[PDB]
Nucleic acid binder design. Structure first.
Lengths: 116, 157, 127
RNA sequence: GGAUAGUGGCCUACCAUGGUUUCAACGGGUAACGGGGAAUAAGGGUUCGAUUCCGGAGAGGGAGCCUGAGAAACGGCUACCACAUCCAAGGAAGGCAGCAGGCGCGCAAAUUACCCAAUCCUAAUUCAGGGAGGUAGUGACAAUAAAUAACGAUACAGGGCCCAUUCGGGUCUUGUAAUUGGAAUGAGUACAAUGUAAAUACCUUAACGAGGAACAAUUGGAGGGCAAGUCUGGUGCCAGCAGCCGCGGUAAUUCCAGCUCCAAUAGCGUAUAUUAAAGUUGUUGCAGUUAAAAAGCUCGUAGUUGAACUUUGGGCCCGGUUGGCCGGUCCGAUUUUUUUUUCCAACGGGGCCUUUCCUUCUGGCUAACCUUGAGUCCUUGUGGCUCUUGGCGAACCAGGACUUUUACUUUGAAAAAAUUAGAGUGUUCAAAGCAGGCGUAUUGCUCGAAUAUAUUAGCAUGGAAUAAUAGAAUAGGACG
RNA sequence: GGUGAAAUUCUUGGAUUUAUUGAAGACUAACUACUGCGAAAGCAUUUGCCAAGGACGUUUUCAUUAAUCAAGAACGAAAGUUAGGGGAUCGAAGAUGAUCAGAUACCGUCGUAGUCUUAACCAUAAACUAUGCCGACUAGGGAUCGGGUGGUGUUUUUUUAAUGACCCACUCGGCACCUUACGAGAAAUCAAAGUCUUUGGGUUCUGGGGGGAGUAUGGUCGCAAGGCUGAAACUUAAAGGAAUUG
RNA sequence: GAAUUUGGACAAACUUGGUCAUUUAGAGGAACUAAAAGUCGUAACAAGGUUUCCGUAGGUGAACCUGCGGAAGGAUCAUUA
């Protein structure tokens, strides 16, 4: 007998933690990032504090016309786009990624749906 | 691709019988376990091979199974998929005259009409066995099947 | 330092060159005994004729296919769910096979102790 | 010695230094209740566990108690710590981790309903009680099914089919901006359910009504991996796409939007774990000269491994199960070409012979043999056994005298149900269920509810190959 | 002098060039290779004293004693530390001389330390053969170390033989290496880097995309320099071998 | 019993200090990473224009240079073949 080895490890304790299908949290600032090499654009993202851990994270309002939220107050749900321990990403260091809110998002919808 | 041309195959079965989904998937999985557990003959004549023998061989079936042989039923894995498909009213109830052509069939299978010798059988994918009794029943009455009995010579397979 | 694959890995190590077999370990009731089950089912020729310190008993002519390599193996289980499984070692179900097991009773062959429902150690496997 | 219901350092005393540990003690960690079993397994494995069932442990933290047969108790007290309520200011109360219900918390989970009918439980000879339990409400929450159309039709055909100088006999595919009838056909609503006298308005019937575009589809994708006629208008490295590869710098096969089309469909995304793919954690089953990977060099403890030798090889006796046809059967009772000669397999098992004790003395039985006191059957008497005179060893019980210690491997017993494997049966099929099935219908008959896996350790067994162990060396051998 | 060419310097001080002699510490030329010996690092002057070592030769003596090893340890180049001895040469730092756009260098030349040494530390290296140790088996030839025979070849031993010494030829042993099939590999190449479908003879060790890094922290070792142990966050999709062509 | 109370054994909890394990604040300091490039100088590659790398030790605006002693993972300018 013998021998245990490396790779994926037990110890955890990250930043959304709940491996959450999101993370509710209020919309601290509206920081439209800026594209990485090769591609190039003003990558409209959003910074917010996670009600849960309070911990602050910033992620792409990724939609296509929807800094509709952009409510410094209002509270999205964020939620990572599995890279996993990485970002996509034309979009430079953004970890998780915008979700739904003010709690309720297509993200565009009720009534109609607009687009994006 | 093979994935593709497969996604052709399935649609072929898609009215090589009559379905509209992945009941092809149903029958498929079936064929697995049937085989599978079966193929796990393995083995000898373990008195087990015995019960299991005339057992799974008692798949027969009527409208169902093979004809007269085996033993090796993996043939089914060939058939079954391409055979177990028939049997049931889903198939073997168009091939019996009454039904004008698959479609013009399931609809009555549903729509109250079409009944297996007493009691309807809406379950538009039952199974047939000792069929000669698969009339209309009807109980003014089941019209589409009661007069269009061109099945009066439906000597088919 | 291990009389088994020692010599079966000289028969093995030989017929791949092709020839008329050669010397081996020293004898061993076990060496000679496999170098029997072999002949007794075929494959090898005639276990041979030396006698020295422990070098005694035999050489052993080759003959036939016997392809390829006698199996040496270095564990030891058996019976029912077993034997049948380690019959995956085999070069294919449909006959061919032969798994020179060690059987509580008798240094026997995949079947030769499949015999009277026997089992135990897994000494080796031929062709 | 004290306590205990009772072992014991359980607690006392007195006395002695002990007990564990690298074969991993001790200590640290657990977003740790254990085991049923769950998920993806070619196999081998990863991964999961508090829904049910067992066993445990706790009702805010923490002690201590009365009660008793039984509790360190939750729906009982007592004090402390902690929250926290009504006060005539004096004092008095409490424990939803039981139903409901609220707050809070967060990614995340429903009603202040009805009931004893069932299953059962608790109290004494009843029929009391029971948010145990069962009905409903909420709820595509994971699962079984499965309609959103079915006909041929009339003619327009654009024509394809055997070509004939035949400008088309029309068997025929289909777009049909055109048109038939099918008093079809489910979802709403008088009746009534063998039904829980509440489910009663519930699946089940039934009768009353009911598709000219509504009685109706979706989610995503259309650069490649991926597979989709994919085109037409807007955008210009702006907006945005894009899991990765990459798209976009006016003519965009990836953005935007229409058309179309692809994929799956009452269901599709997206997140996030995991399992597979992954022989990228490898016992099966990896790699290591340069690609990630030999320690500078030898020593050497633990660990892991370690040459071959000792019983063979010959001979005899009873065996049924697969077999060449029914069969206790080897010169034949069948599968053969005939105007006789005609092949027996192989498989495994028990016993006993050979320089070959199985543990056993006292001696305790059988049914087997040495074999004959009386006899025999018939196919050529060793094809059969009634028979009791002398007289087999280990079966074999039980006191009484002795045994060198294990691995392994073989059936075996015993302990759980559901879980899964899997027989049985038309739950309408299915998922399931453990029902059911005959009739001959005034107290009738009838089968079930299997088997399987029981894996480590224990027990019990049969085996003596492979591997340890010990024995007679100054003989303190070895018998009777 | 001194290089590309100069210069800096030395120099009517007797340098640079010779002439006797002695002085000092390094260092062991040439022969030296096709390599000998060592655990490894590493080991070339003379003689001697000290104790070791493989291979050979026999079957001498034992009989299981063994094989590889986390722990733990002995040796470990060079620099570098401690203290003393000296101190030839060269030569970190440091100066200056040229050279450059720029020179803190590369080219001069002085010169500290150090280079040597003894008692003590340090335990790293492209510490190499970048290839673990033990045993097998798988295929040919040549060449340089101990043992066997024929000895022949020329001389010892000499008045001669023989022997002797080298020396030639056939063997074997074990050495260091070379040259070409099956078989292995991504290649290159490999006498193993070989054998096994894809176990298989026993074991020690290390690897799991790059980076972030051999860094953070902890404990230990040390005088110091450092050694030994040794993360995670985050961050990227390529970095990397071999080959083939420009 | 109630009062009441002597000693006990349990033993909450109070205080004060210790010890673990798990988090966490901070002037500032010093890395890194996105980094493709802006600016100085050319270190590596072509004997990269002083062959290159290995320690180790100094010295540096940055890359570096130099000193001992290694390795070719080489210079093939070739005393040997």
């Amino acid at each position: 007998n013998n021998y245990k080895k490396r790779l994926l490890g037990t110890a955890f304790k990250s930043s959304p933690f709940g491996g959450s299908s999101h993370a509710k949290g209020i919309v601290l600032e509206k920081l439209g990032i800026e594209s990485k090499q090769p591609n190039s654009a003003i990558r409209k993202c959003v910074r917010v504090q996670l009600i849960k851990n309070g911990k602050k994270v910033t992620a792409f309002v990724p939609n296509d016309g929807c800094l509709n939220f952009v409510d410094e107050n209002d509270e999205v749900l964020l939620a990572g786009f599995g890279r996993k321990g990485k970002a996509k990403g034309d979009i430079p260091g953004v970890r998780f990624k915008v979700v739904k809110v003010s709690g309720v998002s297509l993200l565009a919808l009720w009534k109609e749906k607009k687009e994006k | 691709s093979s994935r593709l041309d497969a996604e052709l195959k399935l649609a072929g079965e898609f009215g090589l019988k009559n379905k509209k989904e992945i009941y092809r998937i149903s029958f498929q999985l079936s064929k697995i376990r049937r085989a599978a557990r079966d193929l796990l003959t393995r083995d000898e004549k373990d008195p087990k091979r015995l019960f299991e023998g005339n057992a799974l061989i008692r798949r027969l079936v009527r409208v169902g199974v093979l004809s007269e042989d085996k033993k090796k039923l993996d043939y089914v894995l060939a058939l079954k998929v391409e055979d177990f498909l028939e049997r049931r009213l889903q198939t073997q109830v168009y091939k019996l005259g009454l039904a004008k052509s698959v479609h013009h069939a399931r609809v009555l299978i549903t729509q109250r009409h079409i009944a297996v010798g007493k009691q309807i059988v809406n379950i538009p994918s039952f199974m047939v066995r000792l069929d000669s009794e698969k009339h209309i029943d009807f109980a003014r009455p089941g019209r589409v099947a009661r007069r269009n009995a061109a099945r009066k010579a439906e000597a088919s397979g | 330092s291990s009389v088994l694959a020692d010599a079966l890995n000289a028969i093995n190590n030989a017929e791949k060159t092709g020839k008329r077999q050669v010397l081996i370990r020293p004898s061993s009731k076990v060496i000679i005994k496999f170098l029997q089950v072999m002949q007794k089912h075929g494959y090898i020729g005639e276990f041979e004729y030396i006698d020295d310190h422990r070098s005694g008993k035999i050489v052993v002519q080759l003959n036939g296919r016997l392809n390829k390599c006698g199996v040496i193996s270095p564990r030891f289980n058996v019976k029912i769910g077993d034997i049948e499984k380690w019959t995956a070692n085999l070069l294919p179900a449909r006959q061919f096979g032969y798994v020179i097991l060690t059987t509580s009773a008798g240094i026997m062959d995949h079947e030769e102790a499949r015999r009277k429902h026997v089992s135990g150690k897994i000494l080796g496997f031929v062709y």
